[PDB]
Structures are given as structure tokens and as C-alpha cells.
Amino acid sequence: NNPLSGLTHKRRLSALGPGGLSRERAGLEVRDVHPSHYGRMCPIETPEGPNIGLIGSLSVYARVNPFGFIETPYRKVVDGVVSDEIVYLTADEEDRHVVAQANSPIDADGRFVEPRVLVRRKAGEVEYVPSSEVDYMDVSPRQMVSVATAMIPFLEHDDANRALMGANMQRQAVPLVRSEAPLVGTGMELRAAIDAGDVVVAEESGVIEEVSADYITVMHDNGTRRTYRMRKFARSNHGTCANQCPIVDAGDRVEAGQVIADGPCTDDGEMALGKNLLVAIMPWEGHNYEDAIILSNRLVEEDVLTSIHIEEHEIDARDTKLGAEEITRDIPNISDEVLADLDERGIVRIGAEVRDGDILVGKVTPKGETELTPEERLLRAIFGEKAREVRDTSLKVPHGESGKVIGIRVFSREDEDELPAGVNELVRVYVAQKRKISDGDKLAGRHGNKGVIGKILPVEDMPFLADGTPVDIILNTHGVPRRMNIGQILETHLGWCAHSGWKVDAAKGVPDWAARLPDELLEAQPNAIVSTPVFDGAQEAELQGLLSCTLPNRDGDVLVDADGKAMLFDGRSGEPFPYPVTVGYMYIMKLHHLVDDKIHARSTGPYSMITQQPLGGKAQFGGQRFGEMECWAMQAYGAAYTLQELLTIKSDDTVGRVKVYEAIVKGENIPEPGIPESFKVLLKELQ
């Protein structure tokens, strides 16, 4: 789905499989967080579903030793003195020692501040212990976590329940037309994107000799050259858009290991799964009720949350018993209007735009010489038109699908293209869609605060700040204290501070709250990028202070207070909303749960070979399942005729479904339901 999606996939730790355990064989002990997981396996990253506990991710700093156990880096403490020497410990090795938590205060030389410190001990037990007994200490505070988990700002503020979702959901994000790095980060964004291998890194140092949209050429110091070929508009495994754009201009001096071109969801070599939007924490005329989301039409007009998706369609021409399927522009009983977008071969032309129902690859097959209808024989005598022996077996555009035809791949047995036994011509037509964000598209934050798009109001209907700036997204206040994921609230505050900029008051010295604040942060520009590393980073103190340092706008007016709130005007009525509204910038990802995919419906369709019931799946154009639980619902209602109709003429009554179709197009009454072909199979199966 995205570079992170791939990265986390590789670091998955799965108990399932041959030599492992079944999902039904797993008890509740396998699946809960074991203490030895620390710094080795993530306790946050794991599936929500029935696979929970059995699939995890490897912690960031953990490595594998030749015997297949999981080691983790610990700093060594000689005698209360922290050493920069590091030794990897296996799980049982760590049990025999005594380890100090990472964030325990340490002298400028290396010594501990307090005698008794927080200590992790064997069997998950913890107890204060004098510093003379401290063997090792954690390398980093963010050591128990995985790479995904480590990208959730203010993690220590979210409940593990939604922090878990927030983790799982980042890998569900979709690559947008172009990507913005988040105003608020944790530092992981960089290392992730690079190690993800879906960006372009420079092998050896040198200078950009030539730059194109197609490739980047580098002139090394030793004279040799390496040219990097950009992956452009490629279909992923999940149909997302892996598009790589060069970063460096021509003649730039670049050093080895530097990102010279980023890819999907990546800005300047940093993980960019979403955009930085203008958030307003408030209920709004019910359109954000129960985790529903309201969006500004700006995001549609400005292609902010717009993405590209590619489908790969396929068809082949085999040897049959009546001849061999031939691909041709000549299709039985079809106007030259429907074929107006094909070439001479029978293939769609590149650049053409396709709707569902249209033709992509014109294929015909010789039909079995069976005696045509005595009623169709007479109909061919009147009009004197001889029937063809070739049934249209074309490749048409599936329901829902639509876009521009951005490529054709053709494989001919004739052109010695080694096909499998029986195939002659094989065509693949690639169609891309530029999907604007619509109603029902699933947005999410890094805090498990998911939800679908309820409404997209005109840009003027949106609640706006004093200077006229209309907000982008309106999140519901109610779905916030419930979820315990107030780290989304902290992200909002730090977000706005990062938007406007700030400057602490240095006159009368450096303020006491900003006394722990690293010098570099006492002054910040409008739209400045920051890092709040997990189990580190900004504190609620610094944040509150920073809210007062908020620099004024271009009109010279501060827009939000020290509470983090700001006054809003209803874009509809015009009157100002009575109370101050929490406003800031929150990072929103576009998830792969779009309505264009998820929507489906079926009148009549294909049917089950054995049970004569409708098939299942949007790909098979199947119907819904009206199951055992759903039957009881009808039964409780006492709607017997509905219920009957559902499991009869609407399902597997061979003669009924056909005769109900005729009753509808004729405008007559619905007939009486026959016998369910499934039941006839039962009696024969019992027989």
C-alpha cells in the first residue's frame, strides 16, 4: 500500500504456519504480551482480528543471533558509570542480569543521580535497586516499540487499544498525488523511508550529471557513472501508485547514502503517509456524529486528498475444440461507435478513457455448432442475415472500474513470446484512476481515530478563523475523551505552534518551563518541522508555554490563545460560535477503504454450480448473504413472505428466479415460490 506497509511486512513475526501452530490450537497465553518481548517484539503492533497475538512486529533495535533467538542492545554499566560499550543480550541472558530503564538521569561523566533507581527484573517484576547493582541500562526509551509504533507522536498519551489501531492503520494509508512531510514527527520518518527501499539512495558520492523525469545520472569522483532509473506510475500489489520523483536539480553535489529521489508517500526522504490539515474540535450540525468526518471542499478542488490507483486487466486467446480464439476488432452485432476506441488489432488505444461496460480487448470464439432456434432461424430468413459461428468473448470493463488507459502489454506466440500450452495472443491493459476524496472514504490519524467522510461542504460553509481562513477538517469532540487517545489533542496543539511559529521570551532570562527545552527550539519559523520521540519529546509543560509564544499572522494578530483554542465564525449563519474552539494542525492519512471499491449491488448475476445459489464476491458480481442470524431477524418480525421470498425465488429456485424476472419486466404479479434446489441436493446427498 505504501513504503511503510512493505517495510513492516518484512519485519512481521508470525507463529502461524507449518512447524508452527494453528489458529484454533492457540490458547490465550500465546497471544498476550510476555515480559521478555521487551526491546525484541512490539507489544503494540499486532492484528485486531482473530489473528491477534499470533502476529507481531520486531522491535526497532532487536537483531537475530545465529541460533535463532532475539537479541537486543543494552548499554553497559561498570560501576554506576554508563559505558558507550554495547552488548546484545538474549532473553534468558537478560533475566540473569539487572537492567535500568533508559530515561533514568545520568551524570555528564556517566554516573547515576539517585542511588535507588527503577529496575526491570526477571518474571516481569520491577523494584527499586541501589546503583551499585546496576549491570546494564536500556539503549533508548523508544526501545520496546516497533518501527510503525515509533511513528505515533505522543504515544505515551494514547491507550494501547487505539494506539494499536493507530499502528496497524499507518500501513493502510494510500499514496497521494504528491506528499507532504508531517509538521509533527518523532524522527523515525526519515530512517523508515530510507530503509524502506521505495525511495532512491545514492551509492557513491558525486555530482548530478544529468536529471530527467525518467532517470538520474551521477558523476562519481573516480570517474565512473551510475544511472538510477525512476519507477514511474507503477501498479503495486494492492494497486496503489508507486511513483518516484527526483529530488536533486542538475549539477548538485550529492554525498553517498543521500536520498536523491523519493517515492510514494515520501517528502525529502521522509515518510509522508498523509497531509497536514487545519482541524477544528467541535460538533457540527450532526454531520460528524459517531466518528464521522466533515471535510472542506478545498481538499477536493486542490487535490489534497486525491490519489491514483491502477488496475491490471487480462485476457488470453486459447485453442478450443471449435477452433482457436482470435482477438479482433470485428465483434458480432456491435456498432462502430462502441469500437471507436479500438485499434486495428482489437485492443484499446493508449490514452483512451474507459467506462464500465466498455470494451478493452475484442476477443471472439467459435461457438458450438448446435441447432439454432427454429424461432431464430425464421428471424434470420426474414432479414436474410446469416449467423456467424463466433460468440463475443470480449474483455469488458468490470462494474465500478473506470479511468484512462495508460498502457498496453501484448504477448504473441507468433512473436516467439513463450506462452503456456494453448495460448496464442495474451493482452494486458492497464487503466488508472485519479480518485478524488469522496463521501465514505476512510480517513485516519496516527492515534486510531479513524472514521469515514460524512460530508464535503463548500469552502464557504466551513467554520473559519478571524482572518478568514476556513478550516479543512472538523473532528467530533465526543469521540475523543472516550477513546483515551488525547495524544491527538497534543498533536493538534504542537501542530499549530509548528504552523505559526514561536519565540520564547529571553528577556529576564530563559523561562523555567522552557529550561529543559533544547536551545534550538526557543525560536521557530512558520511551518517548521519537529520531533517528539516516543517516551521522550515535548512535555505538557513546554506545550502550554509554547501556546503563548504563538507568533501573529501576516495581519499582525495572534490567532489562537494559550489554551490552544480560537474563535470561529459559522460559515453558514455568519454569527460567531459562542465559545472558543480548539484549533490546530493534525496529520491525516488516507486509508485504503474507499467507497469506489467497497460499494456493490446485484439484481441477477452468476450462480453456484452445485447449490444453484448466487455466488459471493464483488469480483464475481455476487449477492449478499442473508444468513442464519438474519433469518431469525425476519422470523422475529414474523415477515414470513419476505423471508420465504429471500431463500427461494431470490436465491436458488431454478424456475422461480427466471419467472420472477419476467413478472417484473411484464409488470405482472410476483408468482408463487417453488422448491429450493439446495434442498433437492440434500435429499440426493442423503440418498
Binding site: 558507550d84 547514502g257 519537529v530 517528539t532 513546554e542
Partner: peptide
């Protein structure tokens, strides 16, 4: 700065100094 190692944009970090080892 945070990761002054590859040639990245400067992302200023609230932190206690983390020098044990790079990821």
C-alpha cells in the same frame, strides 16, 4: 537536530540527548 547523518531536512527534536546508537 535529530538525524544529522544522511543529508536530510533538519527536524528539531525535544529530547534528552540520544547518542547510544543509530537505528
Amino acid at each position: 537536530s535529530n538525524n544529522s547523518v544522511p543529508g536530510a531536512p533538519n527536524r528539531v527534536s525535544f529530547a534528552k540527548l540520544r547518542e547510544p546508537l543509530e537505528v
